Amino acid sequence: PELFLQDLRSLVEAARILARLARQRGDEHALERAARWAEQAARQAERLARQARKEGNLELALKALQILVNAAYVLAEIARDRGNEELLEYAARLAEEAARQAIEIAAQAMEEGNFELALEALEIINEAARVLARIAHHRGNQELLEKAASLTHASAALSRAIAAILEGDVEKAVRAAQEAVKAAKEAGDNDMLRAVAIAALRIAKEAEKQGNVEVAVKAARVAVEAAKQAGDNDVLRLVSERALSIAASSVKQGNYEVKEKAIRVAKEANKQAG
């Protein structure tokens, strides 16, 4: 199967070269060839990318999303010099739902603790943010550029939090999570907020694994903040469950104040869930 992506890449490269050549040598049918080749390759990639989530090979899926971003760069190059906004709008829609789908993949990877895939999906997100910014630079949307700065900020924050978790540097992780929830507030996207909450959950799970219940309460206080801003009841349920983990762990550590905080956090999560 995998060779499909390599061939798609080659067709994208051919399109890139043809576009480069066409900026030297005048032929609108070179532009039309390259656009048709590229769009068809992108749709072929999209079919595979949709299939890959059913197949569960997320590695091939995020590789296909990298192809989509790389193709989107070439599509944007063609479109911006050809001077057509509808093709930019198409490329933008392609990139936007691709990146949103990457955010879903990243949430699964962080739930698994399969941080390998999370870092790679975050890379796809970075490169998508690059391509989105290139499009926005020609459309004039300062709002999208602020969102790109926010998206790159948030993906960096997720990366930093992941690094602190892999290191076990949990106070720095809690500090980084406090930065991350502000970055999510800058972004204003519920799916990013979900990914950040899933990170905050996984962060608290590491503190529970350590038995550092007070660090876990700090992590949970961020997690429930993210979940409260997101409004997702399944996240709020998972947060309430983890808060009861922390509460039981706090009684196991023999401290009533950390129990009291953990119960108040569980009750905040329950109050938002209704």
Number of residues lying near another protein (CB under 8 A): 43
> In b/e form, how buried is each residue of 72-110, taking b as 16+ CB within 10 angstroms?
bbbbbbbbbebeeeebbebbbebbeebbebbbebbbbbb
Instruction: Please name which of 129, 206, 209, 194 lies closest in space to residue 161, comparing C-alpha atoms.
Output: 206
d(CA 265, CA 178): 16
Angle at 90 between CA 88 and CA 92, to 5 degrees: 65
Q: Which is nearer to another protein, 38 or 266 (CB)?
A: 38
Give me the least distance between CB of 14 and another protein, in Å please. 4
Give me the least distance between CB of 3 and another protein, in Å please. 5
Residues in contact with 116: Cβ distance below 8 Å, sequence separation at least 6, in sequence order: 109
Q: Longest Cα pair distance anywhere in the chain, in angstroms? A: 78
Taking CB under 8 A as the rule, which mask of x and - marks residues 130-169 in contact with another protein? Answer: x--x---x----x--x--xx--xx-xx--xx-xx--xx--
Binding segment (CB under 8 A) for another protein, from list 64-72, 118-126, 203-211, 255-263: 118-126
Q: Are 75 and 67 in contact (CB under 8 A)?
A: no
Q: Is 20 in the site for another protein (CB under 8 A)?
A: yes
Q: Residue 84 gets which letter from DSSP?
A: -
- Which of 110, 129, 230, 235 touches another protein by CB under 8 A? 129
Q: Is 73 in the site for another protein (CB under 8 A)?
A: no
d(CA 81, CA 14): 18
Q: Are 72 and 94 in contact (CB under 8 A)?
A: yes
Q: Is 7 in the site for another protein (CB under 8 A)?
A: yes
Give me the least distance between CB of 5 and another protein, in Å please. 9
Give me the least distance between CB of 82 and another protein, in Å please. 18
Q: Is 46 in the site for another protein (CB under 8 A)?
A: no
Q: Is 14 in the site for another protein (CB under 8 A)?
A: yes
Give me the least distance between CB of 140 and another protein, in Å please. 11
Point out which residues bind another protein (CB under 8 A).
3-4, 6-7, 9-11, 13-14, 17-18, 20-21, 24-25, 30, 33, 37, 115-116, 119, 122-123, 126-127, 129-130, 133, 137, 142, 145, 148-149, 152-153, 155-156, 159-160, 162-163, 166-167
